[PDB]
């Protein structure tokens, strides 16, 4: 039920795991254990045999264990209201670096049938392209179907957005959301970064972390205020991901040119 606990295991934290062991208390009237019974991520969670898991629960562990094999047999529902959200956040995200970034003056949106910008305050031209345009925002909207072979020598200036639009192929300047290889020979993958020139703010568990981008991170002590920001961006990249959507980069997406951004 909890929401943490709707993400694949693997994505589950310490905490998470405790919570589990609560929601399968009250769920199977089991006998109450301690929170730190299972004292690991969920990571680890997946390594212990149901031997352990006897071994560590006398009196419900080999429960335990079978609901997690239910688990991972047929994955939580999720709710496509939060996934949305998520992925909007992570959109925003990773757009927005990629402008500040490489500096692109113009963005060619491909798939985008609304005319909204996920990033509005960016210096760019934003440009919106679609097959099946909403008639409302047609006006605005290039009526296009884009294919690799009819448009490979198009758009090449600036970067191209797909944001779920699947293509048969993505051209090199892309920025890329796919949900679940040859698609993305021209791309590499893009791992997890958090990127924030909001300002610093001190009023926490410290969050050590090289993927927190943000100025307070340069000396390695983040603000308060950037630790909950990066965390709640983690919870929603991991909501994307345990979800099947992938993310893939032109191949110069360099995250050092955003820790330059800080002069630094
Ligand atoms: N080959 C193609 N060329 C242009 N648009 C395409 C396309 N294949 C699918 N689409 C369009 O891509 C959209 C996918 S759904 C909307 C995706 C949008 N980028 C977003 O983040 O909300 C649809 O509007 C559909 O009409
Ligand atoms: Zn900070």
């Known amino acids: 039920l909890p929401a943490h606990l709707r993400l694949q295991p693997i994505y589950w934290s310490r905490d998470d795991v405790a919570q589990w062991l609560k929601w399968a208390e009250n769920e199977f009237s089991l006998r109450p254990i301690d929170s730190n019974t299972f004292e690991m991520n969920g990571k680890a969670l997946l390594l212990l045999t149901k031997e352990d898991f006897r071994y560590r629960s006398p009196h419900s562990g080999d429960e335990l264990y079978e609901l997690l094999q239910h688990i991972l047999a047929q994955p939580a529902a999720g709710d496509e ?69 009819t448009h490979s020598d198009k758009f090449t200036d600036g970067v191209c957005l797909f944001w779920n639009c699947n293509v048969d192929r993505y051209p090199a300047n892309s920025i890329v959301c796919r949900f679940d290889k040859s698609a993305f020979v021209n791309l590499k993958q893009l791992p997890f970064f958090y990127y924030s020139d909001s300002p610093c703010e001190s009023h926490y568990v410290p969050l050590k972390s090289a993927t927190c981008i943000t100025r307070c991170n340069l000396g390695g002590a983040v603000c308060r205020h950037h630790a909950n920001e990066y965390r709640l961006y983690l919870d929603a990249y991991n909501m994307m991901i345990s979800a099947g959507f992938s993310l893939w980069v032109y191949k110069q997406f360099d995250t050092y040119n955003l820790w330059n951004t800080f002069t630094r």
């Open 81 to 149: 209201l939060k996934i949305n959200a998520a992925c909007r956040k992570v959109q925003h995200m990773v757009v927005k670096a990629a402008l500040l970034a490489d500096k692109f003056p113009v963005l060619h949106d491909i798939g985008n049938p609304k005319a909204i910008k996920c990033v509005p305050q960016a210096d760019v031209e934003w440009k919106f392209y679609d097959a099946q345009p909403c008639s409302d925002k047609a006006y605005k909207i290039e009526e296009l179907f884009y294919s690799y072979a």
